[PDB]
Amino acid sequence: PEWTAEAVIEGCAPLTPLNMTRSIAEMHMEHPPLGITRFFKELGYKIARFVGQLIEPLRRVLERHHLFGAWQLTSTTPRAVFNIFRSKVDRAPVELHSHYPGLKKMYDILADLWLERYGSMKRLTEDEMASAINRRGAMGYQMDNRNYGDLGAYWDSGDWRQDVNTFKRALLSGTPTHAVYNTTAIIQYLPADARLYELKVLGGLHKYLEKCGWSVAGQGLYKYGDRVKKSMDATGAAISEDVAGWDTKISKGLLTLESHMFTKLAEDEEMAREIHHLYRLYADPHMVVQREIEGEVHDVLLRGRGQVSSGRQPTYAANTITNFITTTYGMAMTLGIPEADWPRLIRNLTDERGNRRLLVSGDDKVLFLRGDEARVYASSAYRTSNDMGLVRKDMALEQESEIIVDVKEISFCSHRYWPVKYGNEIHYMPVRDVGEIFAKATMATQEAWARVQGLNMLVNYHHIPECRMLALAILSVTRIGLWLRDDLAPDTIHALITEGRTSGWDQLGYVDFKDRKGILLRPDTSYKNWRRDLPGKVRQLREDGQYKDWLQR
Amino acid sequence: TPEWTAEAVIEGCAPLTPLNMTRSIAEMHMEHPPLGITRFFKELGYKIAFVGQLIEPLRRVLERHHLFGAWQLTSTTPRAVFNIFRSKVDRAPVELHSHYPGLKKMYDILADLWLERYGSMKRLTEDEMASAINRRGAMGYQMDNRNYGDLGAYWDSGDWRQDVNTFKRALLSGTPTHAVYNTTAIIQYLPADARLYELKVLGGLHKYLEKCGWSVAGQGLYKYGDRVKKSMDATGAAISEDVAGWDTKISKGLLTLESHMFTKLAEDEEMAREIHHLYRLYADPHMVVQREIEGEVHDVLLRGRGQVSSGRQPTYAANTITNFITTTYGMAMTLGIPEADWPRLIRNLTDERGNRRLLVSGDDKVLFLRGDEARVYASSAYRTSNDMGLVRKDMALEQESEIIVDVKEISFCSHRYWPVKYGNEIHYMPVRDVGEIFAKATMTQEAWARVQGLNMLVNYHHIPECRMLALAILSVTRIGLNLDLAPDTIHALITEGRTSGWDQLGYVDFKDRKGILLRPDTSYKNWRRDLPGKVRQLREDGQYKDWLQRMA
Numbered sequence A: 001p002e003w004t005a006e007a008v009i010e011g012c013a014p015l016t017p018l019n020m021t022r023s024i025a026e027m028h029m030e031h032p033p034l035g036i037t038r039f040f041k042e043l044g045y046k047i048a049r050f051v052g053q054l055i056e057p058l059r060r061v062l063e064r065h066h067l068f069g070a071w072q073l074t075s076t077t078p079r080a081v082f083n084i085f086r087s088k089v090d091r092a093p094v095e096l097h098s099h100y101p102g103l104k105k106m107y108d109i110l111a112d113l114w115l116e117r118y119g120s121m122k123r124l125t126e127d128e129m130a131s132a133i134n135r136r137g138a139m140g141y142q143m144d145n146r147n148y149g150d151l152g153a154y155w156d157s158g159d160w161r162q163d164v165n166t167f168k169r170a171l172l173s174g175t176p177t178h179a180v181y182n183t184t185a186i187i188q189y190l191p192a193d194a195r196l197y198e199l200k201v202l203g204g205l206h207k208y209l210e211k212c213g214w215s216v217a218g219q220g221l222y223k224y225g226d227r228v229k230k231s232m233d234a235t236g237a238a239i240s241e242d243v244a245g246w247d248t249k250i251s252k253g254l255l256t257l258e259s260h261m262f263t264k265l266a267e268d269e270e271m272a273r274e275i276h277h278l279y280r281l282y283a284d285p286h287m288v289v290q291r292e293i294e295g296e297v298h299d300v301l302l303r304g305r306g307q308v309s310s311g312r313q314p315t316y317a318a319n320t321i322t323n324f325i326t327t328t329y330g331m332a333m334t335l336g337i338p339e340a341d342w343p344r345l346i347r348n349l350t351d352e353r354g355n356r357r358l359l360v361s362g363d364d365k366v367l368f369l370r371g372d373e374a375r376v377y378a379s380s381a382y383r384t385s386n387d388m389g390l391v392r393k394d395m396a397l398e399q400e401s402e403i404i405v406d407v408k409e410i411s412f413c414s415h416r417y418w419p420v421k422y423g424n425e426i427h428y429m430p431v432r433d434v435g436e437i438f439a440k441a442t443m444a445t446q447e448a449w450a451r452v453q454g455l456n457m458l459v460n461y462h463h464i465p466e467c468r469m470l471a472l473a474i475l476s477v478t479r480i481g482l483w484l485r486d487d488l489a490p491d492t493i494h495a496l497i498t499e500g501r502t503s504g505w506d507q508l509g510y511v512d513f514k515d516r517k518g519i520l521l522r523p524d525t526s527y528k529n530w531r532r533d534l535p536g537k538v539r540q541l542r543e544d545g546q547y548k549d550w551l552q553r
Numbered sequence B: 001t002p003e004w005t006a007e008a009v010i011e012g013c014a015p016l017t018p019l020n021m022t023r024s025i026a027e028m029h030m031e032h033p034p035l036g037i038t039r040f041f042k043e044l045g046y047k048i049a050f051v052g053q054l055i056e057p058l059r060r061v062l063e064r065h066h067l068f069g070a071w072q073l074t075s076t077t078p079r080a081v082f083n084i085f086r087s088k089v090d091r092a093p094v095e096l097h098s099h100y101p102g103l104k105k106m107y108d109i110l111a112d113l114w115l116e117r118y119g120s121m122k123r124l125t126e127d128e129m130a131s132a133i134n135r136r137g138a139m140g141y142q143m144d145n146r147n148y149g150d151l152g153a154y155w156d157s158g159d160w161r162q163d164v165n166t167f168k169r170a171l172l173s174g175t176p177t178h179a180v181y182n183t184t185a186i187i188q189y190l191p192a193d194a195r196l197y198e199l200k201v202l203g204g205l206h207k208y209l210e211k212c213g214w215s216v217a218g219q220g221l222y223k224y225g226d227r228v229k230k231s232m233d234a235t236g237a238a239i240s241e242d243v244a245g246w247d248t249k250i251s252k253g254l255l256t257l258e259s260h261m262f263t264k265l266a267e268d269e270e271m272a273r274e275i276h277h278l279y280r281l282y283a284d285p286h287m288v289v290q291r292e293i294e295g296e297v298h299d300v301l302l303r304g305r306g307q308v309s310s311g312r313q314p315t316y317a318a319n320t321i322t323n324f325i326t327t328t329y330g331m332a333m334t335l336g337i338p339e340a341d342w343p344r345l346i347r348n349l350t351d352e353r354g355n356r357r358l359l360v361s362g363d364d365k366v367l368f369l370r371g372d373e374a375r376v377y378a379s380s381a382y383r384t385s386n387d388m389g390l391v392r393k394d395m396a397l398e399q400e401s402e403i404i405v406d407v408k409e410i411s412f413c414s415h416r417y418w419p420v421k422y423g424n425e426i427h428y429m430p431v432r433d434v435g436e437i438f439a440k441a442t443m444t445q446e447a448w449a450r451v452q453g454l455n456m457l458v459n460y461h462h463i464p465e466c467r468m469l470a471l472a473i474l475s476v477t478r479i480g481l482n483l484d485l486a487p488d489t490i491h492a493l494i495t496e497g498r499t500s501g502w503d504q505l506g507y508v509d510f511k512d513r514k515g516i517l518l519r520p521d522t523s524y525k526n527w528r529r530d531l532p533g534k535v536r537q538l539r540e541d542g543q544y545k546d547w548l549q550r551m552a
């Protein structure tokens, strides 16, 4: 119903709403709006086998002492879909605060460092686009009638070349086609022709992130732990605070600074107008979310103001940049760093020099500081993020930050990092609750998709014994011939970790036996019987194809 | 029509039987039948066709009183290349002699010692390769059509990854691709993909040598004199004898022992097959040399048997191993050391214990012995090396060896070594004819010159004219090229940081500044006089620093 006024950000082109009458009509609303949301404006509504068996003998201890989670409601009813929307998404971002000129100055600094060092940003190419799509992606309501199976099918047909140009021409006129977000359970995504356009236009942001020492873009999970140890060694204190529902809290004001920075990176004038028009869409999101009232399912069209959508490929790069800026800003403000040193500050963070480091990935971030500046930051830095509504999760509003002094306690990208011996080298490797690893590996071509999880798990989680054995069991049960290949050997793994200074199955280390507790499986009777029965269990599932014995390693 | 002698059949060793060279020979595009005017090689066919300006005031003195010549002022006509080759390379190695059983035992003893102590040998990693290749290296005729600029452009492209596997797979099949040597003026080399493969397979030999007390592998030249003094201090006499054209005299029989030894070092059986197949190539060398007859330039494909090519990355490591084994075998035989003590002898030479010491680098060797055993070695040890054709350069066949008793008379790696005082320490530093030093040092051009400036300052600061030129080079080249050095780095290399400053970097004595070193006469003083102005005259738009201030 009643929105606050927007912020007036000097020096920035405003994200004026586009003419959405064409895109709204493609959704085919029938009935007037009910209006039961507190921030979103309703405009109208219309009437609507391999990994699992391999881990089944471990399922009971995984449900009881770990986060396997058989408590998945499977089908999210339309009533539950709307309930999640109303509690998590239907909340007004904080638009009015006094930090935009400071934040803008830092967006400008980062943009200038990037142009100075690496030049202007280009649209993605077809091969760069081809390597980045989720071929399993959905088509969207506005394009189901064209009958493609998914994104990969619609990509292979080459029909996207004309839809993307059609989408681009409609967007640049001010009256876009296919501009209304679809939702699933809340994941928000535009139709597939819109997603290839925004991937082509903004996909280059990832390239800059590959050059920044405070980003992990284009690095394997196996590289993260040493980066955490490296940053911790140069500082000694870390602050890792998650924000509750980060996507839902980004303001239209911050999106304006995002658009302003990205247009500044555009190589030509037209590309800048494309980026700007994409953000006119983003800051004025229209989406269709299901409800259920009196046994009747509705598709509900709702209008919001400037949040961040789940299923846009640029979101990761965009969230990563904005999380870095806002964190460095609040940090610089709290520590009293003068504006004149802000260029050196961003430069140093990018180059990993000095005694302050950041690691940022999406809404996930770790701030590294010396002991004295950590205490200063911990006592008051929350005041600035609270002004912008970036409220920290599971903490009281004004609780002082927890200061981490043990590198094994630093959580980042949902993992902690422990030292694992590789020959005479030590490298920090990821650990999380093995229920979560196993849950992803089995839910989150079925024999084809299973063999990827086995290849994934062996490279990334070989130091967790149960993860190596499930990986070797997956590889023994999936058939041959369906960076990591059928010929995946330790030499491939040692090159990723130690650049080939180690070799052989013998030099792939494990975690200490004492720490195989808590998040990892305690080696108990259920574990021993799983291991004892594992070779017998790989033989009963094998069918038809040719196979190799892996558990012997 | 050259008629080779019989080969040698060495017991216990896999023979280096020739490879099917048909495919690799066909890659050279030969057009005409052989002329056949070589005495040893068999012709198969033929086909048709900054620093400089800084030292210029010393050009006259360097050309008359030192070994400078007129650098980069002449090139070699094709007739001259073939004369060079016909005189130096076209000579049969000595394959038939009685020393192969004794030599194999020591090859076996050394291989067993390394395995026991340091484990098996692995192929180099991609970082290990990258940090050892010669980026300006040539591509080879068989690879010019791929339009790479040099080896670095080839390496940075990542196209080498499959070519090396393609080379590997052709080699192991017995019919290699790209196995014929190219030549330049005589340096011989395979195409760039082959040199990456052979560096990958055999590049690990270097790691073994860095652990041997008789090797200077992976040590800077600034460490050599102290090694010479330390070996001299433990012995009292030295014999330093150069072999004329060492590469041209290694036999196929000796290559069979090298291959035999390195296959034993391999960490798995397919590595062993790769090494042996590479030596099936080395022992059966095909190369293309130029010649000129009646005004017509030829590319002549020639086939020989079992000598050593220089444009091969493992050649250094292989040569110093064989140099050590043949020298250790000759000394043991001549001194009457029984076979049962050969394991301890090799171990002791590796550990720098006992009263016999060796220093080996390529074909350069110095044998350190007590005065008594030095007399025995000098009077007959040449018999054994003459038997293997390793004839000593510039001496009669049976001239007794020169016995050296003054540590400063010892030549090793083209240098002699004089004591230079660093604070209260003495360290032996390399000296040679400064005409050679300046000649060796004479875009990428400015970057290259500045590296010669940093190298010369590190290695030759004790030579005054060398320090001054290096400081001049450091003042005339920009800051920030693609190569901050201070004396704190130099002392760290020489005295482990026990000394410090410019004022503790020693000089040679004034009296010894003659002969090989420049005499500080009128040409020298005028050169020093005009150097600051020539430095300013040669500067271009970069950011420079003055270095001449660090002397006078």
Ligand SMILES: [Se]
Binding pocket: A465, A468, A469, A472, A553
């Ligand atoms: Se395992």
